[PDB]
């Protein structure tokens, strides 16, 4: 899953006509064109690659459009790293078009951009077309914008495009899923190729095994949290290296678990009897 983004920043139409030859608003005729200028908006078509591009549909990969951005000619804020942070602090840009997708990104594509005159009527009317431009190319998912320059029969266009994966999605297709977690099913983070990177203090496939504190006697103890050393029954100490004497032992010692060797002049099972 990912997104296709397109940013329009410049359009120039000196005469203020349509692709047919007539003026945008007024008469129908093929001095200038007057003061009622073109009410310009943009339509975006995204489809499969074509060695010889056709100005056709359908838009197999997606489509979008903007409202009226300006008149016959106008300038808008371009895209870039500086502009990406300026948007993270904020309604949203009119000249930005976002086309989300769920399929695997095929890297190759064909982009068609159209400029239209608006007359406050939804009815399709092919005679309101100002300019149509097309670009067949190749792009990979990254947060860097790429600039494109178009000069058709009527208008000049300037725009930037880029592709980004959704969150928890990686690889050049945006189709590899990896989400960081820390529960019974693993303790990992994701890298750039959607691979599992164990958190500090863990190992294993799914990062399910933990590293015990350095020096832990792993024949007498283990760990469930990284960096600890909990002893099995019968052992004690920081490294689980010391035996535990017989339960109740007082003046006795062990070398192996559950022993209780009495000191001199001490008797009984627990070495608790004074024999003086
Ligand atoms: C005739 O149409 C124009 C074109 O506007 C619009 O473009 C179409 C292609 C379509 O996408 C519409 O959905 C879209 O609104 C109308 O002009 C515009 O009117 C809108 C809302 O009426 C304005 O948007 C707003 O901006 C104000 C700040 O100024 C903000 O507070 C609002 O919440 C809202 O976002 C838009 O700025 C304005 N544009 C221009 C160039 O005038 C026009 O109203 C319409 N006329 C009639 C009689 O229907
Ligand atoms: Ca018109
Ligand atoms: Ca107009
Ligand atoms: Ca118009
Ligand atoms: Cl010119």
Author numbering: 27 to 56, 60 to 119, 124 to 309
The article reads:
Two crystal forms of Jagged2 (N‐EGF2) (green) and one crystal form of Jagged2 (N‐EGF3) (dark green) were solved, including a total of seven crystallographically independent copies of N‐EGF2, and 1 copy of N‐EGF3 (N.b. not all of EGF3 is visible in the electron density). All of these copies have been superposed on each other by alignment of the DSL domain, showing some flexibility in the hinge region between the C2 and DSL domains, and further flexibility in the hinge regions between the EGF domains. The observation that Jagged2 is split across the two groups suggests that there is some flexibility between adjacent domains of the Notch ligands and that all may be able to adopt these different conformations. The Jagged1 and Jagged2 C2 domains bind calcium ions (shown in red), whereas Delta‐like4 and Delta‐like1 do not; the aspartates involved in calcium binding are not conserved in Delta‐like4 and Delta‐like1. The C2 loops are ordered upon calcium binding in both Jagged1 (Chillakuri et al, 2013) and Jagged2 and contain the amino acid ligands for calcium binding although the number of calcium ions bound differs.
The Notch signalling pathway is conserved across all metazoan species and plays key roles in many aspects of cell biology including cell‐fate determination, stem cell maintenance, immune system activation and angiogenesis in humans (Guruharsha et al, 2012; Bray, 2016). Aberrant Notch signalling results in a number of inherited and acquired disorders, including various cancers, and it is therefore a key target for therapeutic intervention (Hansson et al, 2004; Groth & Fortini, 2012). Both the Notch receptors and the ligands are single‐pass type I transmembrane proteins, and direct protein–protein contact between adjacent cells initiates an intracellular signalling pathway. All of the Notch ligands have a modular extracellular architecture consisting of an N‐terminal C2 domain (formerly known as the MNNL domain), a Delta/Serrate/Lag‐2 (DSL) domain, and either 16 (Jagged1/Jagged2), 8 (Delta‐like1/Delta‐like4) or 7 (Delta‐like3) EGF repeats. Binding of a Notch ligand to EGF11‐12 of a Notch receptor results in a series of proteolytic cleavages, with the final intra‐membrane cleavage by gamma secretase, causing the release of the intracellular domain of Notch (NICD) from the plasma membrane.
